[PDB]
Ligand binder design. Structure first.
Ligand code: SAH
Ligand code: SAH
Lengths: 266, 266
């Protein structure tokens, strides 16, 4: 996976070993750090479409993961195409949604399936973009399949958090059947934070045996000037930034920034 | 163990399951949180004795643990008596020091061996005292064996930390062969913090099997007025408080307070 630490043989790529705990860790993130529940994310994007008079029918979802946002869009009656680089994540998305969405294994940046009325990318997937250059190339791929005036909504963890909050701190929990640790490290003059994730899964209740699994996730911070510059060059001169899928403009307490990009029109 | 959470059958008392990782966790605490290395603790207590003209020969050490402070005192030529409630901790202290100190298994408060010229209690052992009442009873036991003008030096984690720092936060580390989590919880109107400690010990390098162990430690906060009141009632009207085994008076950044109590004289 481009942009992730070079590591030994048999070391998992992000989500290659942890896909089967992802939904549980999302429930934890919602309860602990303020990650937005998917129904609210879907309410927000629908409100954004309605406020522009967009008769959105076809939605392209990037980095769909296990399909938590995909299922909201499918339930609401959209014709959903959903893409992700991870075969383990996609297998869970297919279990959740079945044939009600069209799934593709694609590593961004790469050409995207044509025909959408709107594009979404939820839950900080864009923090895996390896560079401002790659981010711009991914935004170009989106612009290619969106008509003038159409919208792309995505969220990222705010740049300071990957350097000054989580920054170099540690979080963990012991839930008995599973214990997990996130150890964040960010070197002085880099734009990224390495998250060393470790988990221990109990073999059986009432016994003390566990299996340990580790994954390293490199997360890149993008400041507002970089997002705006790459968006403009990609064909989204208009970009706005909100606080975590609410209509409140982003402020200094925002942890998850929701960017609403509008495709250039005439 | 009085003052510790009532828990199920087969749940370890403090240090009953973790004595064999204690020295390693002290090395971690020294590196991570600023716990004072034992040679410096010993330098500080010796400087305090010299500043009073005390020809200290016999030292009583309370809550000696695995003997890290005991070994400093023995090396420096003192005649050391050392006591602790924990058979697992004392077995490690005897491995370290052998017959060069006189060890007793005693749970404080209780009568102490007579004859000391000075008493010490290092590394926050007094935060296990179950109440201000118990603390006072332990101080009385010390006063009983100390002559007029003699000193008792002990340290405690500062009251605010057990309510406002560690307070309700989490710390953890994954070191490969051992991973550990401290999960601190402190209810609104209590004077104590429960530390849920969990560790996972690797069976062998190059394999993913671990064994999990948990211990719960209830730590009590004592404010300055309480320490001073119980010390006075016990026969130590003079009490002074320093920052972590330096000659600097305690301040608002002090995490480990070093109390120097002087036995009443005429
Ligand atoms: N360059 C890239 N191309 C495609 N998928 C990517 C990617 N970088 C990261 N991902 C995917 O981004 C996801 C991040 S987790 C977010 C999942 C989902 N959007 C949700 O709302 O829960 C993972 O499934 C990961 O495999
Ligand atoms: N009431 C009590 N009576 C005796 N020992 C006690 C006690 N409460 C706690 N302890 C002991 O206090 C120790 C705390 S760890 C500190 C060990 C040592 N003084 C050092 O400098 O490293 C443990 O060994 C524990 O068993």
């Amino acid at each position: 996976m481009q942009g992730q630490p070079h590591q030994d043989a048999g070391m998992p790529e992000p989500y290659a070993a942890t896909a089967d705990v992802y939904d549980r860790l999302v429930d934890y993130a919602i309860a602990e750090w303020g990650e937005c529940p998917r129904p609210q994310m879907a309410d927000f994007v629908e409100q954004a479409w309605a406020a522009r008079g967009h008769r959105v029918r076809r939605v392209l979802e990037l980095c769909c993961g296990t399909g938590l946002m995909t299922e909201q869009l499918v339930r609401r009656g959209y014709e959903v195409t959903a893409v992700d680089r991870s075969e383990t994540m996609l297998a869970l998305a297919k279990q959740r949604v079945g044939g009600a969405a069209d799934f593709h294994q694609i590593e961004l940046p790469a050409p995207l399936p044509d025909g959408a009325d709107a594009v979404v990318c939820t839950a900080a997937a864009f923090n895996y973009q390896a560079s401002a250059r790659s981010l711009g190339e991914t935004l170009r791929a989106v612009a290619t399949v969106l008509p003038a005036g159409a919208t792309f909504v995505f969220d990222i963890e705010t740049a300071a958090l990957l350097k000054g909050h989580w920054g170099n701190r540690v979080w963990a929990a012991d839930e008995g059947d599973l214990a997990f640790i996130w150890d964040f490290t960010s070197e002085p003059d880099t734009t990224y934070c390495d998250v060393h994730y470790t988990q221990f899964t109990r073999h059986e209740a009432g016994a003390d045996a566990y299996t340990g699994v580790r994954e390293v996730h490199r997360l890149y911070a993008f400041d507002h000037d970089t997002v705006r510059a790459q968006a403009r060059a990609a064909g989204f001169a208009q970009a706005e930034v909100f606080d975590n899928y609410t209509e409140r403009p982003a402020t200094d307490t925002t942890r998850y920034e929701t960017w609403v990009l509008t495709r250039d029109e005439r």
